[PDB]
Amino acid sequence: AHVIFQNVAKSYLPNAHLECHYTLTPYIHPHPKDWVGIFKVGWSTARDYYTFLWSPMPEHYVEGSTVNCVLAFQGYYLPNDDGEFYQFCYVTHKGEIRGASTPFQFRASS
Amino acid sequence: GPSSPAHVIFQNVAKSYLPNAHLECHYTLTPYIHPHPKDWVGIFKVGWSTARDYYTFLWSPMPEHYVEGSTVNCVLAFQGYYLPNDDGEFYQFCYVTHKGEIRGASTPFQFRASS
DSSP states (O other), X not given: XXXXXXXXXXXXXXXXXXXXXXXXXXXXXXOTTOEEEEEETTOOSGGGEEEEEEOOOOTTOOTTOOEEEEEEEOGGGSOOSOSOOEEEXXXXXXXXXXXXXXXXXXXXXX | OOSSOOSEEEESOOSEEOTTSOEEEEEXXXXXXXXXXXXXXXXXXXXXXXXXXXXXXXXXXXXXXXXXXXXXXXXXXEOGGGSOOSOSOOEEEEEEOTTSOEEEEOOOBEESOOO
């Protein structure tokens, strides 16, 4: 609950860029090797990612603050419509998960 | 029959990839294969005869907590400076065991700006 994923949909288009919004809550200090992964549900460790992007250190970070971030994942790194469920996970520089979103599928929407 | 036997299946393989951006290659180990530290995935021009014909390659990392008979998802990132540029040729991924045998191959693709 230390990193909250925001406005997470139930599905995302497979071949378009995805915009991942999240909040660095007061309960965590970011670190420049932190990253966000797209993980298939049922994952055990942080090495089980499908794709990832570095979460860039917030400019002029003041401790204990509340910061909202955006990451655009490119469509050609996203899964296809494979019926599987994926989620977002925030991973720190060491490898602890401190954020995990509701699941979602890549496919056309309702 | 067909070749190679599909002991490794490449997943979500696109029709084309960016010439100068890294690509992320996804494959699954089937219950037929027991992976080995010297297995690798190569990018091969279509029409390859043996594992010697590769364009570029990476070692396939040995999966953690490996249990025989399992289906295992893997991913490799090939750097763009090791990828073919827009040469009009067709390529595929192939999984090659340490015994030097091709045990999986993907659908073909070329390196160019996407449609």
